[PDB]
Design an enzyme around this catalytic site. Structure first.
Site, mmCIF file in Angstrom:
data_model
loop_
_atom_site.group_PDB
_atom_site.id
_atom_site.type_symbol
_atom_site.label_atom_id
_atom_site.label_comp_id
_atom_site.label_asym_id
_atom_site.label_seq_id
_atom_site.Cartn_x
_atom_site.Cartn_y
_atom_site.Cartn_z
ATOM 1 N N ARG A 1 14.505 -52.144 62.132
ATOM 2 C CA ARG A 1 13.509 -50.394 61.730
ATOM 3 C C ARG A 1 13.007 -51.248 60.874
ATOM 4 N NH1 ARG A 1 19.229 -51.932 61.863
ATOM 5 N NH2 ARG A 1 20.878 -50.857 63.444
ATOM 6 N N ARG B 1 26.519 -48.781 55.896
ATOM 7 C CA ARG B 1 25.209 -48.774 56.386
ATOM 8 C C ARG B 1 23.868 -48.842 55.983
ATOM 9 N NH1 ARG B 1 21.866 -52.416 59.817
ATOM 10 N NH2 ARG B 1 20.185 -53.624 58.794
ATOM 11 N N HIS C 1 30.268 -42.313 70.343
ATOM 12 C CA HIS C 1 31.296 -41.190 69.989
ATOM 13 C C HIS C 1 31.967 -39.707 70.165
ATOM 14 C CE1 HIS C 1 33.151 -42.186 65.640
ATOM 15 N NE2 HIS C 1 31.789 -42.256 65.486
ATOM 16 N N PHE D 1 32.916 -34.219 65.851
ATOM 17 C CA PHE D 1 32.659 -35.916 65.054
ATOM 18 C C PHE D 1 32.920 -36.175 63.874
ATOM 19 C CE2 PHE D 1 29.044 -38.716 65.122
ATOM 20 C CZ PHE D 1 29.244 -39.153 63.986
ATOM 21 N N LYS E 1 19.082 -39.606 71.312
ATOM 22 C CA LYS E 1 19.655 -39.262 70.061
ATOM 23 C C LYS E 1 19.024 -39.143 69.104
ATOM 24 C CE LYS E 1 22.935 -40.746 66.759
ATOM 25 N NZ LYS E 1 22.958 -40.278 65.492
ATOM 26 N N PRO F 1 23.424 -34.426 70.171
ATOM 27 C CA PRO F 1 22.962 -35.591 69.647
ATOM 28 C C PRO F 1 24.574 -36.628 70.754
ATOM 29 C CG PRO F 1 22.982 -34.327 67.889
ATOM 30 C CD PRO F 1 24.143 -34.399 68.537
ATOM 31 N N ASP G 1 26.334 -40.060 71.668
ATOM 32 C CA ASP G 1 26.797 -41.285 71.437
ATOM 33 C C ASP G 1 28.108 -41.785 71.913
ATOM 34 O OD1 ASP G 1 28.292 -40.075 69.714
ATOM 35 O OD2 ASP G 1 27.651 -40.963 67.987
ATOM 36 N N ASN H 1 22.006 -48.013 66.040
ATOM 37 C CA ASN H 1 22.837 -49.035 66.529
ATOM 38 C C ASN H 1 23.437 -49.309 64.927
ATOM 39 O OD1 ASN H 1 23.925 -51.328 67.645
ATOM 40 N ND2 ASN H 1 22.043 -52.943 67.056
HETATM 41 CA CA LIG Z 1 27.137 -49.356 70.935
#
Ligand SMILES: [Ca+2]
Ligand SMILES: [Ca+2]
EC number: 3.2.2.-
Length: 310
Positions: A193, A143, A259, A306, A238, A255, A257, A138
DNA sequence: TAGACCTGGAC
DNA sequence: CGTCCAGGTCTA
């Protein structure tokens, strides 16, 4: 010359080559595309980061991958060190052969891929990969990248300094499992995290058997490895797939997600067969779809799409 | 199966 | 300036 990050032109004698056409590798499409978060293009076309516990600067010509290492007494890399570079890029795996297979079975791949060659999977260190992606949940590449660097600066060993950049090796399990690590990570901005990192570090050393347990997963089956990974706090389906794909030699790992979903829907008119939205079961299905379409190296295939989306 | 959740560009 | 979104994960 003797200082700062090198360039191919600045210190010619300190570089060495590895035969490698741009068709087999594009540093600019692989290094900043969310596989590893340890590389920065410090000077145009030159990428620097930690690879095999040492600092390197990489750059490429049409047919050569130029490498330089900062260990004293500066000198070009040795054949063995260069081998470490080949292993990191899995250069024994031929992209041309993969692109060809994927293209023949998928017209859409054919199209897009012709404009994005040299996208391959990095073979990452289990630890670095595990905790890097623990930080990716997330969250965005920019970042994540910052967080990971702060993490290494605070808990990883100091390697060498170039210009005003100090490179650090990735933190060991012991250091990440240490007292008050969470509090320190929160001050560094890893958000919730922060707990994941701490808890997973402790979980591994104190309940799974340490480093060995993780490395063992490379010889383990994808399904096994993936299951094993999932018990660690902060690691869902994921993140586990990312790790199996990028560090545990599971090239069929895909994976899924947001995307992946958008692309699946837009470029393949894909929709869940067996819910109609993003959830465990639908994600599991999407991964099988791409696996059934692309084959054993579906994970590599998706990387092409990706890191070609934008 | 719906939010709760650290953070900071992008809307 | 509140609201989204990012390589999601976790829990009533
Ligand atoms: Ca999301
Ligand atoms: Ca978990």
């Amino acid at each position: 010359s003797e200082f700062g990050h090198r360039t191919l032109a600045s210190t010619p004698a300190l570089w060495a080559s590895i035969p490698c056409p741009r068709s087999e590798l594009r540093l600019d499409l692989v290094l900043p595309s969310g596989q590893s978060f340890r590389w920065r293009e410090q000077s145009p076309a030159h990428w620097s980061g930690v690879l095999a516990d040492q600092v390197w600067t990489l750059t490429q010509t049409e047919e050569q991958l130029h490498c330089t290492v900062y260990r004293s007494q500066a000198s070009r890399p040795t054949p063995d060190e260069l081998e470490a570079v080949r292993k990191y890029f899995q250069l024994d795996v031929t992209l041309a052969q993969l692109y060809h297979h994927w293209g023949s079975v998928d017209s859409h791949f054919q199209e897009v891929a012709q404009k994005f060659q040299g996208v391959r999977l990095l073979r990452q260190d289990p630890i670095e990969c595990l905790f890097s992606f623990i930080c990716s949940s997330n969250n965005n590449i920019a970042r994540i990248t910052g967080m990971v660097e702060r993490l290494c600066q605070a808990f990883g060993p100091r390697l060498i300094q170039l210009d005003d950049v100090t490179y650090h090796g990735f933190p060991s399990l012991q250091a990440l499992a240490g007292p008050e690590v969470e509090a320190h990570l929160r001050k560094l901005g890893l958000g919730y995290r922060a707990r994941y990192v701490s808890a997973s570090a402790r979980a591994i050393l104190e309940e799974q058997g340490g480093l060995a347990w993780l490395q063992q997963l490379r010889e383990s089956s994808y399904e096994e490895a993936h299951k094993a990974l999932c018990i660690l706090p902060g690691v869902g389906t994921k993140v586990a797939d990312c790790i199996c794909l990028m560090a545990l030699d599971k090239p069929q790992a895909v994976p899924v997600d947001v995307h992946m979903w958008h692309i699946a829907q837009r470029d393949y008119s894909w929709h869940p067969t067996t819910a109609k939205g993003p959830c465990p079961q639908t994600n599991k299905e999407l991964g099988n779809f791409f696996r059934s379409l692309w084959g054993p190296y579906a994970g590599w295939a998706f990387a092409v799409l990706f890191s070609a989306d934008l």
